[PDB]
């Protein structure tokens, strides 16, 4: 049997990867950045509380204008919230109430939805009739839909729990490109600002870098010890942060292909649902299962601040494009805006 | 101190809040039931009885009571990443046939489908999201089980079992074995039933068990039970 041979060759290549990463590691981010000034304590009060939902909120996304946001909960409805005047722009009833992901378009025209039903439904917000209607159904995937993120107006990248990630075409409705590298259920998806590459974090404790146009996996990151639930790109686009169930946020570089540092604390033992970056990138915000949000410092590996507003598990966390505020949702049906 | 459009927008938000309250009241009056059957099971039958690709849902009203039917048999993924979505359900129906003790899965010859069903039931009962959620146990294919007992002994699946090859004693032993996996004996109740060909009887049992669970939940919320 030459399958064993193949196994040996794969092990040798993994040894080559770890040897190259160890050889390239001349220093660490902690000893480089220990000379700069500390961030200090950061206290954010609750500017606004959005209270329209009646069930547990799973996902949220910010608009390009950083005023309109989209919220999804188990009542079977997507709610478009106005941040400044706490108003409800739209209430979209879902065909399937088992929603686990929602996305707002960069143009502002469409709202993506998905969940335990295998469909990232696209809703048109700018109809002539004045109501919000389903654009089409996207039924290619078999597993539960984990994350939709509008790549563009006509193209939408998505991840599901059938171990694959697909890039769809809005007009045609067919599965334009399918990425099958992962060996575990994919949970988190994040897009780069230059809109060419994207990172997918799965339950095989590895984060994979993918190319949009070409279609193959560039790099893999195997630092985590457990299911990676959240992933988010650094604003530069050369790094990304991952949050998993082992109470550890890990920052990975695309160019260096290694984990610079790990953000963990002894008191924290719970899993990480959602991680986001600030506009500068100095602050890493991470939700937690123990009813809490930790504003870690992305360079000093220190806790800049704590946000303890919510009464239940924080499942979604987003930061505006201008970096003005951070919206956090949870399972008590409340969205809080902090700045 | 706000614009005319701003006012109109606030009025629109109030109307949306109304619609949301009305829809929440409409959703709250329905009783939710999840279904869980390891491998081959009576799911295909039970759903048909209730009526008279992802998650499938059917709506039906029995004795002026609206039932939400949730089935997860098409989800071939890790369950722990989405089982937390079913925290707020009222009942969980675990469907397990009795004719699977001799039959084995087509992945491993040594293990039995009954032990796999016991493992899944243990996992669901000891799950942290289902501490307050009641479980209704359904036992399927009584007649083919009786034929198998007349043809084959029960000791092939339980070596520690010692008793006569009689349907009543074997069914009692299987029911006791399933109900002994409930580690939380106080906060959880198991409603064991033997499913039959008559559609009305199974739905009636569901209605009675659901009625009891609703009464217990309301009393626990009040603090009396």
């Amino acid at each position: 049997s030459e399958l064993d041979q193949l196994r040996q060759e794969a092990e040798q290549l993994k040894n080559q990867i770890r040897d190259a990463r160890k050889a390239c590691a001349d220093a660490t981010l902690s000893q480089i950045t220990n000379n700069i000034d500390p961030v200090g304590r950061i206290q954010m009060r609750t500017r606004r509380t959005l209270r329209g939902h009646l069930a547990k909120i799973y996902a949220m996304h910010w608009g390009t204008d950083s005023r309109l946001l989209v919220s999804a909960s188990q009542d079977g409805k997507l709610i478009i919230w106005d941040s400044y005047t706490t108003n409800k722009v739209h209430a979209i009833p879902l065909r399937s109430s088992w929603v686990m992901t929602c996305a707002y378009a960069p143009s502002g025209n469409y709202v993506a939805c998905g969940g335990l039903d295998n469909i990232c439904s696209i809703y048109n917000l700018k109809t002539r009739e004045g109501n919000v209607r389903v654009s089409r159904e996207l039924a290619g995937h078999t597993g539960y839909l984990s994350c939709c993120r509008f790549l563009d107006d006509n193209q939408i990248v998505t991840s599901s729990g059938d171990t694959t990630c697909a890039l769809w075409d809005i007009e045609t409705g067919q599965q334009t490109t399918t990425f099958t590298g992962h060996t575990g259920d994919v949970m988190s998806l994040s897009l780069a600002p230059d809109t060419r590459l994207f990172v997918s974090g799965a339950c095989d404790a590895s984060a994979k870098l993918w190319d949009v146009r070409e279609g193959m996996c560039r790099q893999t990151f195997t630092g985590h010890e457990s299911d990676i639930n959240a992933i988010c790109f650094f604003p530069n686009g050369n790094a990304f942060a991952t949050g998993s169930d082992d109470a550890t946020c890990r920052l990975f570089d695309l160019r260096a292909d290694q984990e610079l540092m790990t953000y963990s604390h002894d008191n924290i033992i719970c899993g990480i649902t959602s991680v986001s970056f600030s506009k500068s990138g100095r602050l890493l915000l991470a939700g937690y299962d123990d009813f809490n949000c930790n504003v870690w410092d992305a360079l000093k590996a220190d806790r800049a601040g704590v946000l303890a507003g919510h009464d239940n598990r924080v499942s979604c966390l987003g930061v505006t494009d201008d970096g003005m505020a951070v919206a956090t949702g949870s399972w008590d049906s409340f969205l809080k805006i902090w700045n | 101190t706000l614009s005319a459009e701003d006012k109109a927008a606030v009025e629109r938000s109030k109307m949306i809040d109304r619609n949301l309250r009305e829809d929440g009241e409409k959703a709250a009056r329905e009783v939710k039931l999840l279904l869980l059957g390891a491998g081959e099971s009576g799911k295909s039958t039970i759903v048909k009885q209730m009526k008279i690709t992802g998650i499938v849902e059917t709506h039906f009203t029995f004795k002026d009571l609206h039932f939400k039917m949730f089935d997860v048999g098409a989800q071939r993924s890790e369950r722990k990443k989405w089982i937390h979505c079913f925290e707020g359900v009222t009942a969980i129906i675990f469907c397990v046939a009795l004719s699977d003790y001799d039959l084995v899965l087509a992945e491993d010859e040594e293990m039995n489908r009954m032990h796999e069903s016991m493992k899944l039931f243990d996992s669901i009962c000891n799950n942290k999201w289902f501490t307050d959620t009641s479980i209704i146990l359904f036992l399927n294919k009584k007649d083919l089980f009786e034929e198998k007992i007349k043809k084959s002994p029960l000791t092939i699946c339980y070596p520690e079992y010692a008793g006569s090859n009689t349907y009543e004693e074997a069914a009692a032993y299987i029911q006791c074995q399933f109900e002994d996996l409930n580690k939380r004996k106080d906060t959880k109740e198991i409603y064991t039933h033997f499913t039959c060909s008559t559609d009305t009887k199974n739905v009636q049992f569901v209605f009675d068990a659901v009625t009891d669970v609703i009464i217990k939940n309301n009393l626990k919320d009040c603090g009396l039970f």
Partner: single-chain antibody
Amino acid sequence: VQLVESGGGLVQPGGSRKLSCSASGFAFSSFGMHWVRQAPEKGLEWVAYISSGSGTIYYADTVKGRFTISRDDPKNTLFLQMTSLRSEDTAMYYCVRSIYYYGSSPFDFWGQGTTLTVSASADIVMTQATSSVPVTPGESVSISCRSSKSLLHSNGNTYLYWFLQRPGQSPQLLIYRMSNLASGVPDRFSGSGSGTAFTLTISRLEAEDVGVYYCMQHLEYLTFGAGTKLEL
């Protein structure tokens, strides 16, 4: 999206008449509705407004307590009951649909209107410099209007609307909130202003742009301009 209304014709003075409008092709329950009056020689004059939830019913000062506006959402019909008509109401009536939310385009669609003929202060006014200008095709023309009060509210939105009424056709919304273009409006129309003086500019004018331009405010309750007629 269609609005067909009826109930016009000859009305004796002091009588009562009901104008009935039927809306098809869009969601009628979620839209606020307006009634706008246009004299044969004068400009558009606002008459009434009803919201989506049949609340915040607003009237003009000249018709307050004399006209009652109501709607029926399952039948998708808007009715205006007019009582004690004088000789100042012998004018075309237009049904306008407006939805109000962040980024919306209210006053987007106008009805065809019904002729009704009767047999024989403390409001924001709009000032127009000139009423008729000669324009040639392919040229750029700017039309300026003034407001008695600064329309820049504290939330950063200036409430000015521009309407085009071609001869023999209903008014069409061109620019809303003095900057944003409406759906179906070509990109050569543009608007600018500071709070009092407002300018609409047309570059590379086409023969289909010949009509009357009306400016409206929407800060408080709604007044139109006199209208600028464009001639070849």
